[PDB]
Amino acid sequence: TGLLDGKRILVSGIITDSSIAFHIARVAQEQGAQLVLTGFDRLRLIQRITDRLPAKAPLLELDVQNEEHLASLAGRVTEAIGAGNKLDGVVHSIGFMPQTGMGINPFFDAPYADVSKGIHISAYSYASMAKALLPIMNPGGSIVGMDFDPSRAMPAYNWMTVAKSALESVNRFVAREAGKYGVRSNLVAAGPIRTLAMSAIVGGALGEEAGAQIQLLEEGWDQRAPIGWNMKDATPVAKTVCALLSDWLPATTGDIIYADGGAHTQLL
Template sequence: MTGLLEGKRILVTGVITDASLGFHVAKVAQQQGATVVLTGFGRMRLVERIAQRLPEAAPVLELDVTDQSQLDSLAERVSEHVDGLDGVLHSIGNAPASCLGEGAFMNAPWEDVAATLQVSAYSFKSLATACLPLMSEGGSVVGMDFDNRQAWPAYDWMGVAKAGLESICRYLARDLGPKGIRVNLVAAGPVKTMAAKSIPGFSAFEDAWDERAPLGWDVTNAEPVARTCCALLSDWLPVTTGSMVWADGGFHAISV
């Protein structure tokens, strides 16, 4: 049986550990027939070891989305491993501690807020631009989101960044649509990752989700979110763009 991503060439960013959403997307993508290239930042030896845990070991490139020289060279470096890209996963976000938790929204300094916005929102556009030379009609760019149509406890400036990410998705969809490239976000429920551990009071999200999500929610299981990402990276949603697709057990649809 042919896999959903058979023959596709996918760039997956933001892998830190094997708990990362990016890792799980890469794993499912490979299982569905894709050739995967990973990017990491900082602890590159760790990311390289993690890449060995995939069904097939994947090459790892360094990518600091705040370093324009690395963005400018990305297409060339990716080309050393694949002859083009059919899909890109943006799974990158970071906020200094001052931007999360009680009092953060009112007290975080602009320098930290600016860093949060650049890494967690603007980089979606930066990454898409960097990969554009390798992408052809039918390509798909997918970003990881956390639904920010409302304010969340403790999420603060990261929430603002995610709201910006959602707007950037729509503008990217507008500008890349004429090239035949789709741009979408997956709004995932809370999953236990390195990023989640940095959010004060994350356990409150976990408890609320399992209680309210009609389908229930397992914070230790990233595969349903990964499958949703891979569906968007595939050819099976050819006219879906500028959208936020929920993979949250239905939590978003249920009021208090």
């Protein structure tokens, strides 16, 4: 009697045990979902990481920049879940921007080739994944992507913020197409989560000023959030994604749900 009992849900984006997607997968399994996982490049690592999930799930390779992987994906998923079965949910938890597009590297000095790669992986791939999987999704189904509110500019995040603005726009178009299948498409805009990469950045991996700026941003988030914000805890974010995967938000699509402690609603 979990929130997601009987649902078949694909979860992308696990790379470490600090991945937001790891916690989405854990909570969904706790709530009765049957998962198919996708992973990029380091499949041995990902298998070993996902061995710590509450239940065993098949792992498929998916590089979203690889047209063959995308073209074969629906077939591979159907093989994993069995002929005649379809997916009820899809989680996009994929993002990347080359180091030239973040941190103390000046905003104007990011070459377009690097920005384009970041936008490919972080924004266009949400459309790619919906194209590939909508044909094997059930009516009432749900596609959910991860967002970081890009409505105002911020230090350090630079072109990744631009990629998120593009992702929000992409989501509104995906909703039009997904609606033809009876499927919802939405984003969860999370507050900052202290993943391995975010910890490295705060430690100065992309420069001291950038680290200092991101640290101030994290502190400001908890102070603005009327219920507080714990950047070391992905569970509230994972729960929100599961809410959208469930049957309990059936009239919400093309939209953005903020799992940020309410920080975006307060100026200070």
